[PDB]
Structure 1
């Protein structure tokens, strides 16, 4: 996953009860810095870390 990057972000907020965890894309050379949420349906969804709801859910899942 060293060259795995998010080309598109989800535009609407994912309901908090539907999330499991997250990770960041690890290449600094990815065009768009991204966080990857993993949902209860075992899906990986790209989200824009410049949005507040993404920041808040990151803190939530961290605890």
Structure 2
């Protein structure tokens, strides 16, 4: 996704099983205005990953992308 235009719909579901945080490069929010907040994880090939940032375990995933 070169632009955020591709990502219009908000994730209302979770991935089958937890994704590898080590293959995650960066993260981004859906739209915010969505019924429920959600953050998409960017894999090596920019696959569509949906995880709820309100979860403590998910926050750790986002954290690894933020701090050093």
TM-score if structure 1 supplies the norm length?
A: 0.75
Could you give the per-residue CA deviations for residues 8-52 of structure 1, whole angstroms, max 9, x where no partner exists?
122532112211110012232x12210111111221211011222
Equivalences, count: 62
TM-score if structure 2 supplies the norm length?
A: 0.71
Instruction: Give the Cα–Cα distance (whole angstroms) in 1 for the partners of residues 16 and 65 of structure 2.
Output: 20
The structure 1 segments of at least 4 consecutive aligned residues displaced by more than 2 Å after TM superposition are 1-4
Flag the structure with higher strand content.
Answer: 1
Q: Which has the higher contact order (CA 8 A, sep 6+)?
A: 1
* Structure 2 unaligned residues grouped into runs of 5+: none
